Structure 1
Amino acid sequence: IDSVAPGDIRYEDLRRGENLRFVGDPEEIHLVGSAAEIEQVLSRAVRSGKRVAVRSGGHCYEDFVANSDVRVVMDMSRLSAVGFDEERGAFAVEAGATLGAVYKTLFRVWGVTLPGGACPDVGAGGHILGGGYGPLSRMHGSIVDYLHAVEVVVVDASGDARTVIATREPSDPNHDLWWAHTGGGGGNFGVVVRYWLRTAEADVPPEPGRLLPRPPAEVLLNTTVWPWEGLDEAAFARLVRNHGRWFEQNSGPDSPWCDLYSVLALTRSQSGALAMTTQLDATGPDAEKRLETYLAAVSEGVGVQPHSDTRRLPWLHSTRWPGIAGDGDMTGRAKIKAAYARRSFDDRQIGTLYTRLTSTDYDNPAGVVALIAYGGKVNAVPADRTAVAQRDSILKIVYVTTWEDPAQDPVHVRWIRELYRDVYADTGGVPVPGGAADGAYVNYPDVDLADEEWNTSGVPWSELYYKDAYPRLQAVKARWDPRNVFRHALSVRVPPA
């Protein structure tokens, strides 16, 4: 029974993704099992004038799928296969495959991986389309740097749906559709059924073991914690400055430090502690000494000795450690905002962070600003080659608040909005590209970047996410979704006519 309507025991679960702020009201949720099922659902919906959306992993930070207008959901749960497609010479990942399944299959069967996200529950469907990256991206780039081809169901001007395959081959007639899938974002062009991935290096023999990167066999994992109790602004500032300068220096595509990843968590002082998690390739005989060099750089002159715990773990095991994977808790309510950083925070922004993290004004105790190591081999790719236009940044910066009370959304949304606006005040409240920031990342969507009350930079949401990729995305949208069947706040949208 592949349709799910209100009253079905499965409806409460399947009307929602993993973000509990958003409750969808679809008349039907179809657990589709093939391209031909997809074309059937889509043609019927479009002929009937009913708004659609696709869910794969359900990790959307915004209401793109659960939007109250959506009448028909295609849930990709039954399309979760991962394997090696011999007839194409590439690995096939169905849109509903979670990253935990992708990594366990690729690694235990073939000893390879993709430099995708940290959370194992994330789905391929939304993740790859949006420019997925994670712990191994400094070493191996974005997951879209391995996208060889995609199979997507698109809707004609007429309203009927059809299946097409689009590839990286420059002569492929649907090549621009392939390109839009290398960061163009979910819910914009059509329903991805499966992605085909392999290295784009030309010299490589046609063997699965050789067609995607080997991860390090073992890694060093460190946890470092500084108590907040003895920590003044000057100490907080030196720590952020140290960390920022180190990433400014050691993030180039040819840096030996491409094999290091870290997340520095600037937590609310109510939490008791600031913390950092670091992962280093443990292969080379000097790995421990190098890890200590980074850790000593971050703490240098801070005046607060951190607690530090380092363990060596075999690689696949390390991917499920919550220190890297996150804690798995998708209950409660969260608001995410984010930005690219080309350079580290200036002293005035650090002052804003310290005030906002120590203020008793609010008591958002779960609030955090996380600085995620980025760049390295991501930045070897020309900015125009894929739809991930940010190819010279050093960090992704994620601002988070979480809470429990369903009646208290406004105070929590306000806190994070004020914090982000204030950090980015001098560029109209938003991370404007091409300066200290490089705009925003579409898999951390934030409707506020299109809101005139929060964005006073004169730069539209579409340029913050996509920079100069946007006009090429709009040309793909005009060709491939002429009816604008696939849309949401922050969806690629052709120019007004």
Structure 2
Amino acid sequence: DFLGCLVKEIPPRLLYAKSSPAYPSVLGQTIRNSRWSSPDNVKPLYIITPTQVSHIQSAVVCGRRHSVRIRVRSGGHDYEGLSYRSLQPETFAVVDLNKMRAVWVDGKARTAWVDSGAQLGELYYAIYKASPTLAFPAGVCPTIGVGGNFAGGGFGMLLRKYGIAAENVIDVKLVDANGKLHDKKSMGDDHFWAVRGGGGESFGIVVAWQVKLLPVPPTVTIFKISKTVSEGAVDIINKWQVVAPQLPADLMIRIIAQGPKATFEAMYLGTCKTLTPLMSSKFPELGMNPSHCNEMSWIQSIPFVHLGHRDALEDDLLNRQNSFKPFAEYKSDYVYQPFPKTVWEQILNTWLVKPGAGIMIFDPYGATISATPESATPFPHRKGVLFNIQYVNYWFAPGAAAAPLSWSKDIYNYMEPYVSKNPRQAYANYRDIDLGRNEVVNDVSTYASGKVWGQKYFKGNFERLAITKGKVDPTDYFRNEQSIPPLIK
């Protein structure tokens, strides 16, 4: 009867039963992790692909009426696949927002409305079409969905200049657990605060986000400078941890470290001419010179930073043919105090070259991201943060998991004394189920279980998130294994 309920309001075109011949390709289209696409993963009973907001409301009403929970999917990047799989057998539908990819840019007001189903590449491209001197601070990977990226916070190469995506959202269109359509005004301050950074799923289905668009110069400068240990990587990184978080807001230098080399990748909101003396003055250890400069427009920096590409702009931002589906494991940490130089020695000399070693990505904070009060948004990793670490393990055959998974665990153990503690902070969008998962009692996720992983992602904000959840979704309709549990008065 679920199908009959849906088809009353939604075209058959947009309803994919699990038995449907079209269902496997719709399911797989935006799966980004080969661990979660294989037949042993728990599959949704139905996938619904709305093209307008009433289809979302209808699906929710139908879901409530027929006791079918919904997991919403935008770009499909969830590290645990929680947008399209459950961990244990469960009946659920996926509401897959991929056909709702509209981006309307008001270049004059410097605001834009973007559907959650858009990918970052489509958002970024539409901004560029409106103006060569406007930008929006979200993720690095162009295939990330707006929905998940904004709901969990969202950060990238502009985080030092403008903070996270979520703190630059000025309104939303959202469907709640009752199928009611909300904006900022009708949902109220608590719900609007929660939705912008408090994690995907928990607070309802965001249909579209209104954002403020921010200035960038017509030319930005990117560099990618690699250092092995004999070229000085240990001393350069030992300096970087102090220097990079204190650099002017216009300069962000992230690190990608894999095997024998650390690649220092910078985006500077300016020219080589001003970048050169700044580097020689503030970060001379890197040996940056004008030859390392790549001047281009902001929009051009997106494929450049992520892929190294210089002339497939539309392909890199706009292509929706997946084709990158590693088996992948991810973890993250936040660092508040400088590592001893000997820890960098262990990381670069032993950890990164062990069997199963992954990639370590280091993003420096400070400036704007750290200026924002910790409780101002649900994202708490702000004042005092030196840098974020992401531990990324890829493998490419189903039987090759043992070594990377073991390295991932062992390194997280090794790093424990040097990273944040009590709670050990982690970024919500770097979803890591090993941080803890919910217990469900009487069909409702418990506060006590949610608190364990919840304080890691959201620290002191977890409480306001759970109280908000209690008000907007007391029966815990919109949930997953690591979603905000209701705390009800």
Once the two structures are TM-superposed, the CA of residue 39 in structure 1 deviates from its matched residue by 1.5
The corresponding residue for 2:340 is: 346
State the Cα deviation string for residues 347-368 of structure 1 (Å, max 9, x = none): 45324423543554x244xx11
Once the two structures are TM-superposed, the CA of residue 139 in structure 1 deviates from its matched residue by 1.2
The corresponding residue for 1:465 is: 457
Separation of aligned partners in 1, 2:308 and 2:172: 27
Tell me, yes or no, if the aligned pair for 2:245 and 2:364 is still in contact at 8 Å.
Answer: no
Q: Is the aligned partner of 1:372 residue 2:357?
A: no
The corresponding residue for 2:351 is: 357
Q: Is the aligned partner of 1:309 residue 2:280?
A: no
CA distance 1:354–1:286, change in 2 (3 Å): closer
Once the two structures are TM-superposed, the CA of residue 449 in structure 1 deviates from its matched residue by 1.4
Match of 2:158 among 113, 116, 136: 136
Unaligned runs of 5+ in 2: 1-12, 310-315, 317-321, 439-450
Amino acid at match of 2:176: V
Match of 1:3 among 3, 15, 20: 15
Match of 2:436 among 438, 441, 450: 450
Match of 1:241 among 219, 238, 242: 238
Tell me, yes or no, if the aligned pair for 1:179 and 1:387 is still in contact at 8 Å.
Answer: yes
Q: Is the aligned partner of 1:276 residue 2:259?
A: no
**Comparing 476-485 and 375-384, the one that deviates more:** 375-384
Separation of aligned partners in 1, 2:476 and 2:308: 36
- Calculate the TM-score normalised by the size of structure 1: 0.81
Once the two structures are TM-superposed, the CA of residue 329 in structure 1 deviates from its matched residue by 6.3
Once the two structures are TM-superposed, the CA of residue 379 in structure 1 deviates from its matched residue by 2.1
Q: Is the aligned partner of 1:153 residue 2:175?
A: yes
Instruction: Give me the identity figure in percent.
Output: 24
Amino acid at match of 1:222: F
- Map 1:43-442 → 2, pairs under 5 A: 43-68=61-86, 69=90, 71-84=92-105, 90-110=111-131, 111-156=133-178, 161-167=179-185, 174-198=188-212, 212-227=213-228, 230=230, 235-250=232-247, 257-269=248-260, 273-283=261-271, 285-293=273-281, 296-298=284-286, 309-323=292-306, 330-354=324-348, 356-357=350-351, 359-360=353-354, 362-364=355-357, 367-392=358-383, 393-424=385-416, 426=417, 431-432=420-421, 439-442=425-428
Once the two structures are TM-superposed, the CA of residue 248 in structure 1 deviates from its matched residue by 4.7
State the Cα deviation string for residues 71-119 of structure 1 (Å, max 9, x = none): 2000101211111479x99421111111111111112214422111111
Amino acid at match of 1:375: G
SS, match of residue 176 in structure 2: strand
Tell me, yes or no, if the aligned pair for 1:447 and 1:490 is still in contact at 8 Å.
Answer: yes
CA distance 1:474–1:450, change in 2 (3 Å): same
Tell me, yes or no, if the aligned pair for 1:220 and 1:288 is still in contact at 8 Å.
Answer: no
SS, match of residue 320 in structure 1: helix
Separation of aligned partners in 2, 1:259 and 1:70: 48
State the Cα deviation string for residues 332-352 of structure 1 (Å, max 9, x = none): 211111122223323453244
- Map 1:18-29 → 2, pairs under 5 A: 18-23=32-37, 25-29=43-47
Once the two structures are TM-superposed, the CA of residue 416 in structure 1 deviates from its matched residue by 0.6
Separation of aligned partners in 2, 1:445 and 1:407: 23
Separation of aligned partners in 2, 1:355 and 1:285: 35
Unaligned runs of 5+ in 1: 199-211, 251-256, 301-305, 453-458
Once the two structures are TM-superposed, the CA of residue 152 in structure 1 deviates from its matched residue by 1.2
Separation of aligned partners in 2, 1:144 and 1:94: 14
Separation of aligned partners in 2, 1:440 and 1:358: 21
CA distance 1:307–1:377, change in 2 (3 Å): closer
Separation of aligned partners in 2, 1:122 and 1:473: 24
**Comparing 141-150 and 349-358, the one that deviates more:** 349-358
- Calculate the TM-score normalised by the size of structure 2: 0.82
State the Cα deviation string for residues 252-300 of structure 1 (Å, max 9, x = none): xxxxx1111122122123xxx3322111122585233224445523469
Tell me, yes or no, if the aligned pair for 1:241 and 1:345 is still in contact at 8 Å.
Answer: yes
Indicate the structure with greater helix content.
Answer: 2
CA distance 1:356–1:337, change in 2 (3 Å): farther
SS, match of residue 277 in structure 1: strand
CA distance 1:363–1:299, change in 2 (3 Å): farther
Tell me, yes or no, if the aligned pair for 2:336 and 2:420 is still in contact at 8 Å.
Answer: no
